[PDB]
Each structure stands twice: as C-alpha cells, then as structure tokens.
Design a binder for these strands. Structure first.
Ligand SMILES: [K+]
Ligand SMILES: [K+]
Ligand SMILES: [K+]
Ligand SMILES: [K+]
Ligand SMILES: [K+]
Ligand SMILES: [K+]
Ligand SMILES: [K+]
Ligand SMILES: [K+]
Ligand SMILES: [K+]
Ligand SMILES: [K+]
Ligand SMILES: [K+]
Ligand SMILES: [K+]
Ligand SMILES: [K+]
Ligand SMILES: [K+]
Ligand SMILES: [K+]
Ligand SMILES: [K+]
Ligand SMILES: [K+]
Ligand SMILES: [K+]
Ligand SMILES: [K+]
Ligand SMILES: [K+]
Ligand SMILES: [K+]
Ligand SMILES: [Mg+2]
Ligand SMILES: [Mg+2]
Ligand SMILES: [Mg+2]
Ligand SMILES: [Mg+2]
Ligand SMILES: [Mg+2]
Ligand SMILES: [Mg+2]
Ligand SMILES: [Mg+2]
Ligand SMILES: [Mg+2]
Ligand SMILES: [Mg+2]
Ligand SMILES: [Mg+2]
Ligand SMILES: [Mg+2]
Ligand SMILES: [Mg+2]
Ligand SMILES: [Mg+2]
Ligand SMILES: [Mg+2]
Ligand SMILES: [Mg+2]
Ligand SMILES: [Mg+2]
Ligand SMILES: [Mg+2]
Ligand SMILES: [Mg+2]
Ligand SMILES: [Mg+2]
Ligand SMILES: [Mg+2]
Ligand SMILES: [Mg+2]
Ligand SMILES: [Mg+2]
Ligand SMILES: [Mg+2]
Ligand SMILES: [Mg+2]
Ligand SMILES: [Mg+2]
Ligand SMILES: [Mg+2]
Ligand SMILES: [Mg+2]
Ligand SMILES: [Mg+2]
Ligand SMILES: [Mg+2]
Ligand SMILES: [Mg+2]
Ligand SMILES: [Mg+2]
Ligand SMILES: [Mg+2]
Ligand SMILES: [Mg+2]
Ligand SMILES: [Mg+2]
Ligand SMILES: [Mg+2]
Ligand SMILES: [Mg+2]
Ligand SMILES: [Mg+2]
Ligand SMILES: [Mg+2]
Ligand SMILES: [Mg+2]
Ligand SMILES: [Mg+2]
Ligand SMILES: [Mg+2]
Ligand SMILES: [Mg+2]
Ligand SMILES: [Mg+2]
Ligand SMILES: [Mg+2]
Ligand SMILES: [Mg+2]
Ligand SMILES: [Mg+2]
Ligand SMILES: [Mg+2]
Ligand SMILES: [Mg+2]
Ligand SMILES: [Mg+2]
Ligand SMILES: [Mg+2]
Ligand SMILES: [Mg+2]
Ligand SMILES: [Mg+2]
Ligand SMILES: [Mg+2]
Ligand SMILES: [Mg+2]
Ligand SMILES: [Mg+2]
Ligand SMILES: [Mg+2]
Ligand SMILES: [Mg+2]
Ligand SMILES: [Mg+2]
Ligand SMILES: [Mg+2]
Ligand SMILES: [Mg+2]
Ligand SMILES: [Mg+2]
Ligand SMILES: [Mg+2]
Ligand SMILES: [Mg+2]
Ligand SMILES: [Mg+2]
Ligand SMILES: [Mg+2]
Ligand SMILES: [Mg+2]
Ligand SMILES: [Mg+2]
Ligand SMILES: [Mg+2]
Ligand SMILES: [Mg+2]
Ligand SMILES: [Mg+2]
Ligand SMILES: [Mg+2]
Ligand SMILES: [Mg+2]
Ligand SMILES: [Mg+2]
Lengths: 207, 54, 118, 123, 114
RNA sequence: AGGACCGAACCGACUAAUGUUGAAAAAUUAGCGGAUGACUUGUGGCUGGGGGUGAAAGGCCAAUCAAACCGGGAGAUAGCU
RNA sequence: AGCGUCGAGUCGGCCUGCGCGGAAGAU
RNA sequence: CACAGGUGGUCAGGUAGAGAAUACCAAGGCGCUUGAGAGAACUCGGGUGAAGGAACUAGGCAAAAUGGUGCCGUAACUUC
RNA sequence: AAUUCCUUGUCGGGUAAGUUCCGACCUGCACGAAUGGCGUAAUGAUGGCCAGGCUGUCUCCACCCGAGACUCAGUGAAAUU
RNA sequence: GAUGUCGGCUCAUCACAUCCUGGGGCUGAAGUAGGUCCCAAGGGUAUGGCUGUUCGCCAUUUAAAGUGGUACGCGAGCUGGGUUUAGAACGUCGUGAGACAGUUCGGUCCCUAUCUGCCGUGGGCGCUGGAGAACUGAGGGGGGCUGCUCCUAGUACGAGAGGACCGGAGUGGACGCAUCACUGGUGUUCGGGUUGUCAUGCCAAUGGCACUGCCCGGUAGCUAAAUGCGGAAGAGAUAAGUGCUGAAAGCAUCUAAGCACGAAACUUGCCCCGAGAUGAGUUCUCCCUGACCCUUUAAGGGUCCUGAAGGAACGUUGAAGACGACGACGUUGAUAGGCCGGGUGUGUAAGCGCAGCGAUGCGUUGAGCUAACCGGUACUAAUGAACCGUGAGGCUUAACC
C-alpha cells in the first residue's frame, strides 16, 4: 500500500557533509481504513482510506453513512490501495507515516499544475519558425499537419494545441530523506507534481 | 475557406439546439417590502435583506 | 496563466487604471455612495480602504501620502477629519458592495459601493 | 556554457591569446561545454613566437566560465570571462608550461592535475 | 507554512554575523581532499544579499590573480564555517552589480564610519 | 560661390512589417532620398487618337492604353464553346 | 547400411500427378 | 461611406532647444458614435533577458547599435 | 570578365573548412577601341566580398505591457452552394 | 470553365533492400579489429564553410550521421534564393523586330474553415426507482536511444605489439515528465535615482506627461540555462541460430512424435486515459412506505396531498479555467476583500534639528514605503427562502425461504 498526504511545499536539508538536498515536505496524517475489499465480495483485494477532516454539514448523508459504517470520522476524500498477498488490514485501523520508516524510495502521484490551453511550442516542444526573414503570421504556428492526398487526413495522436497539465502524474523512485511520526512528515528528495496544498499519493517505489 | 454544399435547415437547427435561453431559477422575496428581486441584488425600490439602502 | 496574480486589467493600460481609481476613490469619499460596474467596485475597495486606514493616523506625513494617492486636498481633508475618526474602532471593511442589476446601454453588471456607516 | 563560435581567452603560456570553439566534443547534438569539458578550438590570435600559431586547430579544456559552476550546497562560482587551456590534439596534455588566473576544483581528476598543480589558486 | 518554518528554523545558524553590501567579508569555507578537511579563505566585497530565512545567500566579489571571481554563498550551509567582516563599506544600493563594470580606482568603496 | 554639406516644412518612394471580403481599387507604421534647384507649388492656357506628350518605362493621355472614350456601320465575322 | 558378421530387400536414373524453396515496399 | 488617403493661402504664445525639429504647456479644441467582462492558444504592436554572439539566412532581412557641442587628432588615394 | 561553354579552370590570398570575393595566369567556347577601349578622385536608398561594434537573426526560447482572439448585451456582412 | 512548379523552414508518417544499438552463421576469425551473409524496424540516426541549390567537395563531430515511399510528403502552414512576365546589359545569333535548355542586376505569394480529419472541451439522452461515492479493466495511448570511465584484468589470447568475452559499478550526451527548494530571467501592480516640462498659490513636498520618459534594484507568479526523476530489471511466447532424444532410412539426422535454449522486434511488466465496454460491469452508503377518481383496462390519464436523499441555481471564489467544466466556501462561516502581526523588497521618507556662503552632508533612522507572500482576524460581501428531483420502483422464469 501507500498513504495519502498533502503537499506542504519545498525546502532543503543541509547534510553534515555540506550537501543541500532539495526536499518536498509531505504532510502524511493518519490514513483511516474506511473499507476493506476482498476477493469474495468485490473480486479484488484493497483498502479504502480517508485522511484529514471534513466539515460536519458538507458531508452528505450517503457519504456520512459510509464513514459511519466504518466507525471513522469523515476525511476530505476516499482513496484505494491494492493489497499484496502478504498484507491484511481491518476497517477503522489507522496507518501512519511510520509505514515508510524503512522505505528508501517512493513514487509520488499528484495532479499536475494546470497550464490551460497550451500551444504546440509549450505543450510539445515544437520549434518556432523564423522570427524574421519574411515570415508571415507564422512564428509559433504548428507548420504542416500532414502530407497530401495520400493519406488525405490527419493521423490520430497528432501533436496539436490544447489543454496542458491539470492531469495525474507519477514521479518514480524519489529518495525518502526523512520520516517523522511526531510531526506527520515525510520528506522526499526533489520535486513532486501539483500545487502547494494538493493531494499526493505516496507509495514505495515499484522500480 | 467556404462550404462546397449548402448546409440544411436540419443542421442549422441542430447547431441552434444549444442557443436556448435559460429562465431565472427563482426570484427572491424581500424581508420588508415583499418585492420580488434577483437574489443577492437590491430590490427595485432600494430594499435589500429588509433595509432601505437607496 | 495568471496563477496567484492580483489586480484586474479592465481593458486599460496601467496609467489609465491608476488615474481612474484615483478619480473614483475621490468620488466615493465625497458622495459616500456611487454606482459603478461590479468589477470596478470590487477593485475600488483595494484602493479606498487603505486611504481610510492611512486617515486613522493624522500626521503631516500621512496627509502628503494621501495627497500623493488622491491629488485632492478636499478629499484628503474629509479622509483625516471625518472618515478616519468615523472608522477608528472598525478594522477594515469600510465599504459595502450591493449589486443593482444591469446597465441599459451595455448590459454591464452594476453595483453600489458605499461607506458602511453612511 | 561555451558553444560553437564562442571566443575564449587563454589561461596558459602556449602563445594563443584568443581561441574560438569550433566543436563541443563528447556527444551527438551536445550544445554546451562547461568547466572541465574538452572543446575543439581554432587559434584566432597568437603571440609572435609561442608554441602555437594562428589558424592552428587543436583541443582545449574549459577552466573558467561566466556561467560558472554550482557546488553541492547550492553555491555558485562565476568568473568574469571564459578561459581555456590548450591541449595537444592527440595526447590531450597541456601545451603550455604555466597556468594563469584561478581554476576550479572540478578539474581534480587524473586528467588535469598539471593544470591543478600549475594554477595559482583552486576554488 | 508553519511546518516549513519549524523544519527550516532548526537548520538556521544562530550566529550569522551582521553585514551589509559594500562590506569586505572574509568567508572561510570547508574544502575536502578525500578526507583532508581544511578552511580556504575567500575575501572580497559583499555585492548582494538575499535575505530568505534558511535560503539566505550573499555574493562576494574579488579580483583573483588578474581575474574577477564572484562566489554566491548559501548562508546556513555547513560549507561556510565562518564569516568575518574586515571593513564596512558606505554604499547607497542593496545590489552593487555596477562594480562588475569597474576596476581598480573606479571600484573603490568609501568606508562606513560608525 | 555652389544642379555644395547636415536637417524640418515641402517634394519624393530605397527596405521591412502590417493590411490583402483593407481604414485605403496602392495605404499605414518604423526606418529611407532630395530639400537654392535639371527644385517645388496655386490659378488659367495649349497639344487629340496612328494623334498627342515622353531626361524613353511602350510610359502617360480622367481608377481605361502595342492605339482613349462615346455613339454609329452592327445582329461585323465566329469551320469554335 | 552398420560391419570377419547380420538376414531381405537394397541402389540410381527415366517418365509423370500434386505439393516445397527460390519470394523484399511503403496509411 | 460621418472612409486612417488627397487639398492652395494666412496667423505663429510659454519653458527647454540651433530650430517652424522635439518634449511638456497657454489661448483654444478634443477623448476619435458599440460598450461591458475575462486575462487561454494564436496573430498584431511593444518592453526586458542567463551563457553564447551571425552559429540565423539566398542575404545580418529584421532588430540591436551609433547618435550632441567644444577641443585634440585623423591614412591610402586625389581631378588638390 | 555584367562577356569563359567546358568550369567550382589553375595558382596565390583570406577561412577550421570559401562553387562567392580579391590578386594573378591566358587555354578570349564567344573582349577590343566613340552601337567606344583601358584607367579614374568624388558621388550612389546601385551589385559582390570581408572585418570591428552590435544584438532574440540564431543556439532556444522565457516573462511581461498593450490591441484582437474568448464571454455577455446591441447591431449585423461575405465569398460559396 | 487552373491539380501552384525547384530548394529551404515547420511538422511529419510508413517501408525495410538496416546506418547505429540487439541476436547469429561462415571467415584466408589468435586477441583487438575487420570481411561476408542471415535475423531484427524497439528506439536512435551531426553541426558548420562554399553554392538557390538537392547534391557534392571541404572542416570538425558522432554509437550512427541509413536507403526509399508519402502529388520527387507538407505554399487554403511559412519562405521565395532557383526558375518562366513586363525594366536593363554583356557574349552570341539575326539586315531587323527580336532571340538563347547562355550569363548578369531588379522585380506584388490572396482566402474570417461549411464538411471530412485532427487536438482539446462541454451540453443531451442512455445504461430500467432516484441519489452520493469508491472501483474493476474490455480497450486505447505514452515510453523503449546511447557514449565514456573503472572493476573483473594487463587476466584469457599472443612471439611480442597489443588485448577481450561473460559479469558488475560509476558518470555523461541526446530525449521526456514534473517542479520552483536552490542558481537565474521576467516582474508597465513594490522601492529608489534622475533629465525636460506642466501643475498642485509659493517654499518645501508631491503628482501628470515624455516608449514604464530614461534608468537601477526587485516580491509573488510564470519560467530554463535551474534540479529532481525516467528509459529498466523481471516474465511469457519467439526470429535467425544452437541443441537433446529420435526414427522414417539397421547407420546418420535439431524433427517427422517428443523435449530444451535463443534478440532492443511480439505479449506483459512501468506510466496515463478508460464502463457510450449500448457487451453501458462491480462494491459501499443514502433516500422516498398518502388518499382518490376516471375510462377504448393498461408498463393507461388526472385531481388533491406530499417534495426525500440529492441536485441545481445564486453568491464569495481558486495554485481550475477561452466559455462550459473542475475544486474550495456561504454566518453552525476564514471563500474573497479589508484589517492586524510577520516576512520580503527597496535602501536611511517627511518634518524638525544640527554643520556649511552654498550645492549638499549628518542626526532623529536600517528610516519610510512595501503587489500577487506567510500567520491570523468576522470588519465588508457570501440571505431566510425559492427552484429541480418524488411518494417503495416491469414482466417472465429459476432457486430458495
Ligand atoms: K486610335
Ligand atoms: K565572351
Ligand atoms: K554607333
Ligand atoms: K561600390
Ligand atoms: K521520410
Ligand atoms: K559476423
Ligand atoms: K528500428
Ligand atoms: K504535384
Ligand atoms: K515551396
Ligand atoms: K489545398
Ligand atoms: K496561410
Ligand atoms: K465532406
Ligand atoms: K526559482
Ligand atoms: K522570480
Ligand atoms: K516631474
Ligand atoms: K456503467
Ligand atoms: K475543462
Ligand atoms: K480575509
Ligand atoms: K537621514
Ligand atoms: K528624514
Ligand atoms: K526596511
Ligand atoms: Mg492553471
Ligand atoms: Mg530553430
Ligand atoms: Mg503579406
Ligand atoms: Mg510577424
Ligand atoms: Mg479514404
Ligand atoms: Mg450557438
Ligand atoms: Mg490570491
Ligand atoms: Mg474590449
Ligand atoms: Mg506613461
Ligand atoms: Mg544640394
Ligand atoms: Mg515619380
Ligand atoms: Mg514614411
Ligand atoms: Mg546627398
Ligand atoms: Mg538633406
Ligand atoms: Mg520593352
Ligand atoms: Mg490611367
Ligand atoms: Mg488598331
Ligand atoms: Mg454591315
Ligand atoms: Mg454578334
Ligand atoms: Mg513454384
Ligand atoms: Mg466616426
Ligand atoms: Mg477623413
Ligand atoms: Mg499640403
Ligand atoms: Mg515654439
Ligand atoms: Mg512638433
Ligand atoms: Mg495578451
Ligand atoms: Mg528589446
Ligand atoms: Mg541574451
Ligand atoms: Mg538584470
Ligand atoms: Mg548578458
Ligand atoms: Mg563579441
Ligand atoms: Mg562576421
Ligand atoms: Mg552562415
Ligand atoms: Mg545554416
Ligand atoms: Mg537593416
Ligand atoms: Mg532600432
Ligand atoms: Mg560559369
Ligand atoms: Mg563568414
Ligand atoms: Mg581557389
Ligand atoms: Mg557568405
Ligand atoms: Mg578576378
Ligand atoms: Mg562589346
Ligand atoms: Mg574604329
Ligand atoms: Mg564602334
Ligand atoms: Mg472547376
Ligand atoms: Mg530484412
Ligand atoms: Mg517504429
Ligand atoms: Mg512494429
Ligand atoms: Mg517491447
Ligand atoms: Mg551540408
Ligand atoms: Mg513535393
Ligand atoms: Mg521524403
Ligand atoms: Mg500564404
Ligand atoms: Mg497544401
Ligand atoms: Mg526568385
Ligand atoms: Mg525585356
Ligand atoms: Mg518561492
Ligand atoms: Mg533576479
Ligand atoms: Mg525591471
Ligand atoms: Mg503654479
Ligand atoms: Mg520645489
Ligand atoms: Mg497635462
Ligand atoms: Mg500633451
Ligand atoms: Mg520619473
Ligand atoms: Mg527483457
Ligand atoms: Mg539414431
Ligand atoms: Mg537500451
Ligand atoms: Mg505590513
Ligand atoms: Mg529589508
Ligand atoms: Mg520618496
Ligand atoms: Mg545609522
Ligand atoms: Mg491570506
Ligand atoms: Mg444559511
């Protein structure tokens, strides 16, 4: 499994050898198991977790009953983690950042920052045409988008302008710099997806 | 760039399937005057949430 | 993108916006209620309410800083003599915005902006 | 951050005064040489009676850059000019007998220890 | 926010001495030859300060064997062992980048009498 | 003194971008040339179509030019569509 | 054929029916 | 066309300036007959840019640059 | 060579590298003496070539300020079929 | 009654007759390195000088600088150097007008996208009572490059010279994704310096205008040159190829039966989309338990009563965004603005005092001011409602109770 945390921000750890490690600080508060899924009922093995805290009134009756069945306080969302053969948890069990105490590498999944409607220069690293030398209205424009009568169409997956970012992104194999049960902190080396305050999924590195 | 064929009255109407105007969901009723008004807006007679403002 | 940016451009250059908000801030301190477009009214609070804050502490410095930001000694006088003392115990929120529908000529969303104790 | 056409000053007594980078060596489409990278150079200006002549094509190691060098704590060392030490084309050993101005500790390999040794300062 | 504050606070050197742009500082930095650790002095003019908590930095310019050298130190780095202010300079500006275009007599800074 | 020099008005039109169902059936913007002369400009006059006028480009002769425009021969003729 | 021995087939052409390889191309 | 064009003459303030250039003003005249929001791509017109500096390109096209007054000083060549 | 087809002639210069350029050679396909020959200071929005300065021309683009584009209200075209 | 033509630029896409990387047989293959043939299309596959060039030659790289198809791919995407209008000249031909599969200088590149296509993004209805969530994964897409160094080992091999396989570790190039902690760029919303001028009565102090007047710094954000991460290992089935056992054919034979191995290709493993997957799936939770009339009586049509869960709407908004959408928040409230404290940036405000003939200096004073930042704080605006959505959800058959 992994744990759901929040992106606090970035800072550094100065080591004794005079190395400055860039860290992302991840607030990993207690993940409370809301539902255990099994091969009999659900067809697969997983735990559903919640974390954080939700306003008493903005929890709907359908959502409130789901939390009420577990015997857990409502958190800000629900997330699943697939279980391996070895693992077992119970409904209501808390899992803390201490799960990662002996984990050396993590994959961190977030929602990337939203860039809105991006052109092909920004989105796909297309080269600009001439700034000068007679170029008419075609500086950052895409250029050609196909051939001729053969094939007489544009192929699917053609790189064009459109929505960029605001999507799920994993960054793999980030070194765990520090675990801190006391302050509910996981520090990982380097950048992770998403804005400050965004939800992050952290799992032990698959590679 | 221009059409090679005249589009139909059918296709015209299909495009205009999204042009329909939406009515105001409901009007709000002022506390004091009892004048109906646009919600979060001041009434025609200068009341808002039961207070003479203008 | 405009991530974390503040300020409306209002289809103006920066010199125009500054001049307009100076004129409009004056107008509001004089009359105490003005009707404007909802985004202009919303922006006017970010100019006006600092001027009233500055007017709470009547010094020669603050009067010149007020005059810099208004260019109207009549407006400066009302800030320091009337509004500053009027709003002394109040911690910001010297103005309120009340929406008042739509302008006939261009369907602009309009609003009143007034001083709260008017 | 040196590329093709970049003019470099010379930090040795080979006889060259100004050299032009004509190739950043060590990979396809490689854009830049920084401190410690070997470049191919042409000599544009030389002293009357050095070991090298104007128009000679040989190698050099970049020893100072304006872009500079980052250190593991996040610090930077920037120089006021770009400078290199001329190397023999085949051997890649320094042609000159002396080194002028400071070098960086990035040159500490097996390779450039003559330069390290001869330099007045290492940063 | 408050979390990063506390993470950062506990790494900040409490004994960073006071200095300003125009001051001649000597920065003693640790230098490693395998295991042999020694202090190398870097003395010159402070031309810029970035005050930014743990992420504080300062830029020291010196002319070094005929060549101008700027080093940007990270203030709370263990690399920087000590900072001694040697002279106090009297400048107006926060950033003295204009000294990059000056040499010798032009680049002299009047001493700050206090 | 000057078909002298630098440079506004004024007269031009070398380059580029824009514009190209234009703001404009030839322009705008930034630069560009001449600027006391073989200069430029107002008003009026004269030269008429195989004719004019031309520091000559077949240029120009009312947004028309290797033979103007209008009317007429005239429903030219069209082994072509 | 394997090899003195062991026990029934064994050898290479001819003609001919049908197959095999020779046989790499661009949405 | 209530059209960024074209159209001869006359008048000529202040400060700075060689000036009828240019900047800011006076007298006087006007804000150009759709507005309101938003602050994507892309296009247009601009500003700034690490390191490099013509490697761009048919071509340094475009841009960047130079830019004033006084004084010092100034080559080949020349019809002086 | 504003002339040379063969031709990027050959040799020299410049460049790391020069079908262009400059200087030569003469093998002038197919120069040549007022449909002028050769030279020439000065002049040129003239053609070619080189250098210094300079730079977003480029490596390789980034950000920002404005006008459109986008949304709302009013008015309301076009080629084509 | 028009299918724009060379070369470049931008963007490609396919073939394999493979340039590199991978696998392998033979060699006149000791090793290293070659030659030749077979398999293999996963990914990768120079910058410059000259020339309109494609090309070519040259310089210097690289693991390599592949060959072709795509209207000699791509001008409703750009260019316009070549070439083929009108000007002009040279050589040449011609008595000449003129002409040249000669040369030379100059010489307008239009289109607001209806349809298909493609990139993004919504609205509708469906999925069989309605609703809020979490999912499964049919299927689809992305990714797949490689140098050098060190160890193994100066070991095998070799007379020496030189010098490995196999295996392992490090560090790069190019490419991609994310991010802004650091280094920087930008920062016409912050601070300051300064020229000309106009004004605020004047001084002092300020503001306007002059490209943000010109500049110097710089916060947040955005961002690359900044710094984190990636390509995989592994698994399955194989290609060329190598075999085991093994007859047909007493022998032999990798093959006919049977069995093993074998590559960046293939199927997975990694990442992302994904139930309109109409084959519309699953799991968890929530909600609605009135009366009555009519008649061609049927999955029928009304009246009154009722109005849930939830949704929407409106408002304050966002590191979300063209608009829709998506997320936060609406007083039982930190959603935004303001305000308070801090930080950051600029660099010692004004006023007054003191020194000086004065410009100006010094003190008060690291002052004043300070955007988008951080921590807080109900002062202002997020309103009581109203609106949409209903009232236990077909038939058959089966199993069971
Ligand atoms: K005639
Ligand atoms: K000839
Ligand atoms: K003659
Ligand atoms: K000339
Ligand atoms: K191709
Ligand atoms: K082989
Ligand atoms: K391949
Ligand atoms: K064609
Ligand atoms: K073309
Ligand atoms: K076409
Ligand atoms: K076009
Ligand atoms: K069609
Ligand atoms: K940054
Ligand atoms: K920044
Ligand atoms: K002023
Ligand atoms: K479904
Ligand atoms: K969207
Ligand atoms: K607030
Ligand atoms: K002071
Ligand atoms: K003061
Ligand atoms: K301060
Ligand atoms: Mg965004
Ligand atoms: Mg490019
Ligand atoms: Mg054009
Ligand atoms: Mg353009
Ligand atoms: Mg087809
Ligand atoms: Mg519509
Ligand atoms: Mg904000
Ligand atoms: Mg507008
Ligand atoms: Mg201005
Ligand atoms: Mg003259
Ligand atoms: Mg003319
Ligand atoms: Mg002009
Ligand atoms: Mg002249
Ligand atoms: Mg002149
Ligand atoms: Mg002619
Ligand atoms: Mg005419
Ligand atoms: Mg005739
Ligand atoms: Mg007749
Ligand atoms: Mg007829
Ligand atoms: Mg056959
Ligand atoms: Mg008008
Ligand atoms: Mg007019
Ligand atoms: Mg005139
Ligand atoms: Mg005047
Ligand atoms: Mg003027
Ligand atoms: Mg814009
Ligand atoms: Mg600029
Ligand atoms: Mg630059
Ligand atoms: Mg700068
Ligand atoms: Mg620079
Ligand atoms: Mg330079
Ligand atoms: Mg040059
Ligand atoms: Mg070039
Ligand atoms: Mg080129
Ligand atoms: Mg130019
Ligand atoms: Mg310029
Ligand atoms: Mg020739
Ligand atoms: Mg050149
Ligand atoms: Mg030659
Ligand atoms: Mg050239
Ligand atoms: Mg010659
Ligand atoms: Mg002749
Ligand atoms: Mg004669
Ligand atoms: Mg003659
Ligand atoms: Mg046709
Ligand atoms: Mg093959
Ligand atoms: Mg492929
Ligand atoms: Mg394939
Ligand atoms: Mg594969
Ligand atoms: Mg080439
Ligand atoms: Mg073609
Ligand atoms: Mg092709
Ligand atoms: Mg075009
Ligand atoms: Mg086309
Ligand atoms: Mg041409
Ligand atoms: Mg002609
Ligand atoms: Mg930051
Ligand atoms: Mg900076
Ligand atoms: Mg700035
Ligand atoms: Mg006055
Ligand atoms: Mg004064
Ligand atoms: Mg004025
Ligand atoms: Mg004015
Ligand atoms: Mg100023
Ligand atoms: Mg594998
Ligand atoms: Mg056998
Ligand atoms: Mg590989
Ligand atoms: Mg504050
Ligand atoms: Mg400070
Ligand atoms: Mg000030
Ligand atoms: Mg002091
Ligand atoms: Mg806040
Ligand atoms: Mg309420």
């Amino acid at each position: 499994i992994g744990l759901v945390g929040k992106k606090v921000g970035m800072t550094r750890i100065f080591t004794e050898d005079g190395v400055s490690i860039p860290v992302t600080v991840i607030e990993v508060e207690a993940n409370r198991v809301t539902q255990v899924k099994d091969l009999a009922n659900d067809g697969y093995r997983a735990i559903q977790v919640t974390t954080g805290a939700k306003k008493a009134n903005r929890v709907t009756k359908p959502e409130a009953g789901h939390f009420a069945k577990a015997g857990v306080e409502a958190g800000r969302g629900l997330w699943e983690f697939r279980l391996a053969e070895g693992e077992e948890f119970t409904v209501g069990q808390s899992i803390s950042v201490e799960l990662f105490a002996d984990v050396k590498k993590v994959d961190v999944t977030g929602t990337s920052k939203g860039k809105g409607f991006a052109g092909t220069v920004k989105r796909w690293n297309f080269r600009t045409q001439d700034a000068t030398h007679g170029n008419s209205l075609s500086h950052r424009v895409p250029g050609s988008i196909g051939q001729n009568q053969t094939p007489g169409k544009v192929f699917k997956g053609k790189k064009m302008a459109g929505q960029m970012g605001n999507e799920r992104v994993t960054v793999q194999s980030l070194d765990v710099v520090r675990v801190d049960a006391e302050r509910n902190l996981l520090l990982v080396k380097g950048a992770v997806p998403g804005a400050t305050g965004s939800d992050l999924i952290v799992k032990p590195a698959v590679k | 760039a221009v059409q090679q064929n005249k589009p139909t009255r059918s296709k015209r109407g299909m495009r205009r399937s999204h042009d329909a105007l939406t009515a105001v969901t409901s009007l709000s009723v002022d506390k004091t005057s009892g004048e109906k008004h646009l919600r979060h807006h001041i009434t025609a007679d200068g009341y808002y949430r039961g207070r003479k403002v203008i | 993108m405009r991530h974390r940016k503040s300020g409306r451009q209002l289809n103006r250059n920066s010199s125009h916006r500054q001049a307009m908000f100076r004129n409009m801030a004056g107008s509001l301190v004089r009359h105490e209620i003005i009707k404007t477009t909802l985004p202009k009214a919303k922006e006017l609070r970010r100019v006006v309410e600092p001027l009233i804050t500055l007017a709470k502490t009547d010094s020669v410095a603050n009067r010149r800083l007020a005059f810099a930001r208004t260019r109207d000694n009549e407006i400066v006088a009302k800030l320091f003599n009337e509004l500053g003392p009027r709003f002394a115990s109040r911690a910001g929120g010297y103005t309120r915005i009340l929406k008042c529908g739509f302008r006939a000529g261009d369907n602009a969303p309009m609003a009143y902006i007034e001083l709260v104790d008017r | 951050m040196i590329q093709e056409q970049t003019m470099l000053n010379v930090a040795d007594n080979s006889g060259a005064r100004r050299v032009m980078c004509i190739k950043v060596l060590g990979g396809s489409h490689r854009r830049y040489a920084g401190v410690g990278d070997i470049i191919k150079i042409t000599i544009k200006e030389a002293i009357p009676r050095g070991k090298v002549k104007k128009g000679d094509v040989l190698k050099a190691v970049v020893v100072r850059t304006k872009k500079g060098v980052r250190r593991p704590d996040g610090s930077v060392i920037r120089f006021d000019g770009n400078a290199c030490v001329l190397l023999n084309n085949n051997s890649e050993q320094p042609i000159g007998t002396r080194i002028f101005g400071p070098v960086t500790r990035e040159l500490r390999s097996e390779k450039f220890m003559k330069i390290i040794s001869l330099a007045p300062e290492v940063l | 926010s408050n979390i990063i504050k506390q993470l950062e606070q506990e790494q900040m050197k409490q004994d960073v001495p006071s200095f300003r742009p125009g001051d001649t500082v000597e920065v003693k930095v640790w230098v490693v030859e395998g295991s042999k650790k020694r202090l190398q002095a870097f003395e010159g003019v402070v031309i810029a300060i970035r005050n930014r908590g743990l992420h504080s930095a300062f830029t020291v310019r010196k002319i070094s064997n005929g060549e101008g050298v700027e080093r940007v130190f990270q203030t709370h780095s263990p690399v920087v062992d000590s900072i001694s202010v040697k002279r106090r300079g009297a400048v107006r500006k926060a950033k003295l980048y204009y000294l990059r275009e000056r040499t010798g007599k032009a680049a002299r800074i009047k001493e700050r009498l206090n």
